[PDB]
Design a binder for this molecule. Structure first.
Ligand SMILES: *[C@@H]1O[C@H](CO)[C@@H](O)[C@H](O)[C@H]1NC(C)=O
Ligand SMILES: *[C@@H]1O[C@H](CO)[C@@H](O)[C@H](O)[C@H]1NC(C)=O
Ligand SMILES: *[C@@H]1O[C@H](CO)[C@@H](O)[C@H](O)[C@H]1NC(C)=O
Lengths: 443, 443, 443
């Protein structure tokens, strides 16, 4: 659609709006199965290759049984990303997998898939899961390999290597991942199977269209949890994202340090808005994502995970127009570190140029077209292809869109360096004012 | 076994105990070899496919020789994770690989594996390494391909593609990993080979049982170091973990911010125990792992790496019962950032609810069963399936175990906001008291 | 060459010099193509396997077309690594891929590769890109599969599975990577193709030699961007690194906390040089890399990316000899956290030993040879194989080189604990002096 951007000279920040939301709010767990064969069996070259591929099948099953001597688990914890909470990503999938170990539970799944490959099963604890038999190695081995150290053809040797290769690759992934994988590969769930799973999935037609048109993103936000091998059934849970928030406005906040440009070294004070990240309207509040690198962007669609978010009042948006607004305490950090750098935005580039640093913006066909002076400045991607700050070359995003340079005095000029609080990583406008008042009292 | 949990209302923290240790304390280096063939050789379709697979073999060897023009190296450095030291993970493996470049050293290995595939070799510097020949491409090429632009069969074309595929995949992994890979794949070392390596390994019967029952974890903590190609031998060092600490008590500390709940904005002070992470008794002290996500958990067994640990006095455990104890200076951080979030624990969930945030705990079959008020609170996973804080849904771990809610006044109530030190990421109880005393002196 | 190291007892730091630079300063974008076939077509076992592999070809094309419904994008942001700027890594490649969607542009590439596989094409916006047709599936399908539900041979079934496997694997990588991959695999660009691309690349003979001898590093610093499928052409952009800075001196700075060793707990003050990382002379300044783990090291050659760098005055090197020099304000952090740890350097080990921690250096053949006392100390890798601090065992790098122990009084002794500022993560020598002067004024 229409991506736009506004740069705020007063606070050394830029906001890119025009994006639409696609937020991971929940999980849907499906049970993928592979029906196994339980077999016990002079020789020629064609049969020797079959027995070789057959031992790869036996060892793969043995390896997966050895891998599941314990509850499946992943690694769990105990700018503002350090403010986020701590979830357990696969807790819902592990719970479903715990149910499959109850006796008779696997038999319910084995029975529902006897006449078809797609089925919805209600488990003993009342959870409605979608079940899927993607490979019937039982039917192949018992009907195309059991008739054989007897006669054989090589068209069978090849077809068995093709059909067994999926189980071998699924085992490889689970082996180097301790039974939990993300993203979900095409061996765990092919593109045809995933699209079929999304269509038979119980969701809105909006969610189906969104997931089908972005299967690569659905893969990156899914988990494959190796579950159980019991009664000739190989089952692993695939945990798929639910997008409960769709098509709400999103905007990306880019920030860079704002410093004074005095010549005498050590006299300079700096200030940086710390609330950078993705923002999306969500249920009367704003879902704020401090680590924007956790969100995936596809054109104007933004895919984030609410586990990596804070829920803030919508008044946080006021910090972009008036950082001194009386309704929200805008978060900033203070420092005396005036180092030069640049932040590439959606439609331009913020340049924090200080000291003796050479800062330019160039075009590919003409070279330098603008030389930045000391301070925090901005250039749009129209006519500009590269930005240089020191020895670092930045390419700018060449996506179409309009920028707006909002002129304003840098707020760092309003502060007396003698009473400026420094080394505050987690501060705000009011906290700095409160500390300056305490220092001015002692003077 | 028996996992239990205690929540401390006074300090907004929870401790999960009942776990057993499995700590990576050292390394064992083994030398895996692949015996190569040194060959120089109208045509039909079956031979054409053999010559195609033969050039894949030549290019794989050429590619691995080009990759080892230099010493193998990985990337090295120069809540409390920033306190950890800096190791060189593959320093022991690289040292062993440096020895294999000394002349006559590879010949010692080539000779020991002439009659068998398992052998222990004493190297020139006196290191006892386990040597393993996993693929003899020399024997296959010289006996099944050298007899051939002559007659041929397709059962050979297939068997050569199968046997050569391992060298092709080992080359692929080393190519996109600069010769150092982790975890160690099934191409580097199959499950049968790894288990065989662990059994012939010189360790306790306890370590063998532990490694064999958790090969997937052993893979994730191992490195494969591409070493040398000399005299028809392809050697790469596999660096396997040593678990010198086993079956000692472990417990996981979860912490969340504790803030005052005053209505006037900006008047609230916060406090967070920063010593969260995994703790395991280890040789009279406690091995503390500040980034719990570096540890892998299998049922009640906890796999950590001592490189990611601090060695602390056992009195650090006193911070869970009495954070004001006179024997250990409990680490905390101070802030005025009262944002809402939740921390999912082993057997429940800590909820830090502040401001206007909607915080609930729900059951799948009935919906909301508890609404949290402002402050830091806790709920156990019995009867609870989800926790919601703002727009973020958390699933709780559904593992069996008993929780205990230890009531106590939040220690944040004991502090005067007028003299409260703020923005201290690396503080402690005594440091805060020392700073408050200095502020009270000036008043 | 000659790697050397100096340890500074005064500031608990060590500098390793003797390295040569190889800095990623720019990007070169090439367009890799795969010519596709557009086909629409009782049966036997050999043909059935062909139709099975043919549907894998159709589904792979359909999957890649479904993947490119949107602009390709990656994840972007919005000790001193938090000072770095924010780039858009694939902005140059995405720009080139945007040009290929203009009409007639793909036809220009399709035409230039009709008679050869290597070609340089000038695009409509005037960018000179290197074009490469690596797979002609059109020529194979239209000439070896179109003659066929008729007669067939199995030597064709095998050759088709071999030739189609590359497209299947390229699709797999793009599927689990949202169309952007790094490092660039051997399926995206084989070793023969990459070396050929580097030779036909327009660069210095120095850059060609450097890239050819370190293709594994070039792979790790490259991106493969899935671009377009139009008019029987499968095109993806490969973004290759440009090394504009080569063979300048580099040195690695290792730092560890320096604390007082008083016996009464809580009275100790600590100080840590925060400017650790890689340093390379670059165009009159110094390119400083605060997160040394982002640089890859091959023997004495150091591969870094200027996007992960700050451009500093060369006087920053003065902090190693005289941390109180009047020309550069050396960056330090202050704390009261006196925890023990070690930092493994290039040629030795720094040991910060405090409290009751057992700190030793050992040899493999004799055990402990040195016991560290409280403070910050150092040992070289000559005669030393392991260092132990608490329950953590460190192996030291066994590379050849000379160390120099520069004796000096620890600067932490020069500070009065009563007026020592604490919890300053982003401080400097002058900022600490400025704060001590303010505290001494109030006293
Ligand atoms: C605190 O500081 C602000 C601005 O610096 C000022 O407007 C306000 O009056 C001060 N309050 C007190 C109590 O000093
Ligand atoms: C320091 O503060 C603590 C508690 O705030 C108090 O018990 C102690 O007496 C104080 N010491 C001094 C020297 O002020
Ligand atoms: C600041 O401190 C330094 C050293 O602590 C001293 O040399 C200098 O004179 C002080 N300056 C002032 C204005 O107090």
């Amino acid at each position: 659609q229409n991506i736009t951007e506004e740069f705020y000279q007063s606070t050394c920040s830029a906001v890119s709006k025009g994006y639409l939301s696609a937020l991971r709010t929940g999980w849907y767990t499906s049970v993928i199965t592979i029906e196994l064969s339980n077999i016990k069996e002079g020789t020629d070259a064609k049969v020797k290759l079959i027995k070789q591929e057959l031992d790869k099948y036996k060892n793969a099953v043995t390896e997966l049984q050895l891998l599941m001597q314990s509850t499946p688990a992943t690694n769990n914890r105990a700018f503002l990303g350090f403010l986020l909470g701590v979830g357990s990503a696969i807790a819902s999938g592990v719970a479903v997998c715990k149910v499959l170990h109850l006796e008779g539970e696997v038999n319910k799944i084995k029975s529902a898939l006897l006449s078809t490959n797609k089925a919805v099963v209600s488990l003993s604890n009342g959870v409605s899961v979608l079940t899927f038999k993607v490979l019937d190695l039982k039917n192949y081995i018992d009907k195309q390999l059991l008739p054989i150290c007897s006669i054989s053809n090589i068209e069978t040797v090849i077809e068995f290597q093709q059909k067994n290769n999926r189980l071998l690759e699924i085992t490889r992934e689970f082996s180097v991942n301790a039974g939990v994988t993300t993203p979900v590969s095409t061996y765990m769930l092919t593109n045809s199977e995933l699209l079929s799973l999304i269509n038979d999935m119980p969701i809105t037609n909006d969610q189906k269209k969104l997931m089908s048109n972005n299967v690569q993103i659905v893969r990156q936000q899914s988990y494959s949890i190796m579950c159980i091998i019991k009664e000739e059934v190989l089952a692993y849970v695939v945990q798929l994202p639910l997008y409960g928030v769709i098509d709400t406005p999103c905007w990306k906040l880019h920030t860079s340090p704002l410093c004074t440009t005095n010549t005498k070294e050590g006299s300079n004070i700096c200030l940086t808005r710390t609330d950078r990240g993705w923002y999306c309207d969500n249920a009367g509040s704003v879902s704020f994502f401090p680590q924007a690198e956790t969100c995936k962007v596809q054109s104007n669609r933004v895919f984030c995970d609410t586990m990596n978010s804070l829920t803030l009042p919508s008044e946080v948006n006021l910090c972009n127009v008036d950082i001194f607004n009386p309704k929200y305490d805008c978060k900033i950090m203070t420092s005396k570190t005036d180092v030069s750098s640049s932040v590439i935005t959606s439609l331009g580039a913020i340049v924090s140029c200080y000291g003796k640093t050479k800062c330019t913006a160039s075009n590919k066909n003409r070279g330098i077209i603008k030389t930045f002076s000391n301070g925090c400045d901005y250039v749009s991607n129209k006519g500009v292809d590269t930005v240089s700050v020191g020895n670092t070359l930045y390419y700018v995003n060449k996506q179409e869109g309009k920028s707006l340079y909002v002129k304003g005095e840098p707020i760092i000029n309003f502060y007396d360096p003698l009473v400026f609080p420094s080394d505050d990583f987690d501060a705000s406008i009011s906290q700095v004012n409160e500390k300056i008042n305490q220092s001015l009292a002692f003077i």
